[PDB]
Amino acid sequence: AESHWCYEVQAESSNYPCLVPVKWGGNCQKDRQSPINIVTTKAKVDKKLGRFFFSGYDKKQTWTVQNNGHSVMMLLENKASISGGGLPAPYQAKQLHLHWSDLPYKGSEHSLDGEHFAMEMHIVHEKEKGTSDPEDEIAVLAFLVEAGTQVNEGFQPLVEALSNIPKPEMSTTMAESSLLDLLPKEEKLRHYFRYLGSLTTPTCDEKVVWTVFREPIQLHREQILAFSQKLYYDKEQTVSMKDNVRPLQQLGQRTVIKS
Ligand SMILES: NCc1ccc(S(N)(=O)=O)cc1
Ligand SMILES: [Zn+2]
């Protein structure tokens, strides 16, 4: 640890030294890492990957959202959970965050068939374990965001909040909203890809069961741009928050499956 981890854009846009992704520590240099490219036609169908059950996702709340220095993060505080989805247990929702750029063809961490989307939203959940840490301790739901001209009304509480948390360690309260307001129609979430991997920031622990849904969220270009326009990596506000994306990792001998 000669300096704090950063994204490539941070090193490029500031003179202050920081560790770019290819130099990250902890478990980041191991071999079941994320994100990956998914060749959709090569992922095998597994019949056991059934529909998800969301609990607490329809409920209107006033979520707390904060700039943690490398993303914007809603604190979910177990107020929601998931089961199904071919998962081994229910998982409790901890936080929701995003990764983005300011060009429509980049911003996502994963790629489908070599295409990056304009953003990627991660909902982070924790395993309800039994008595017998594991490979699937964390379930992250990943949604790709496609830029367009459709105004997503569901996103507007989040987008309006961004103005209030431009600097790291700032928090605010969003207007009344549900998690489903942020997602595609539930019927469209039957198609997803599944693999085992890591967290995409240090320490990059290899304890994540990944789900990447095929159906993108549609967001207006300018709702996407609001992220890089309103947020900063630093209190000095010298580097607009964008390209908070880990580069693609090698699948190696792992297998990707789909519903
Ligand atoms: N702060 C721990 C943490 C949680 C979630 C991720 S991610 N990008 O979903 O893989 C990374 C780090
Ligand atoms: Zn993430």
Whether the link from the prior residue into 203 is cis, omega within 30° of 0, is yes
List the resolution, Å. Answer: 2.0
Question: Ligand 1 pocket, 140 CB below 6 A?
Answer: yes
Contact present, 27 and 203 (Cβ < 8 Å):
yes
Structure tokens at 43: 């992922």
Distance in angstroms (rounded) separating the CA atoms of residues 233 and 33: 24
Instruction: Count CB-CB contacts under 10 A for residue 225.
Output: 17
Question: What b/e sequence results for 173-185 when a residue is b if at least 16 CB atoms lie within 10 Å of its CB, and e otherwise?
Answer: ebeebbbbbbbbe
Residue 42, both tokens = 């090569």
Q: What residues does each domain of the chain span?
A: 1-259
* Selection from 36, 41, 90 nearest residue 252 by Cα: 36
Q: Which ligand is closest in space to the CA of residue 207?
A: 1
**Contact partners, residue 144, CB within 8 Å, separation at least 6:** 108, 110, 112, 117, 119, 120, 212, 213, 216, 217
> For residue 41, what are its two tokens?
């036609």
d(CA 259, CA 86): 9
Termini Cα distance of the chain: 41
Is residue 110 flagged as an active site residue? no
Query: What is the C-alpha to C-alpha distance for residues 45 and 228, in angstroms, rounded to an integer?
Result: 37
Q: How far apart are the CA of 196 and the centre of ligand 2, in A? A: 15
Specify the fold of 1-259.
Carbonic Anhydrase II (3.10.200)
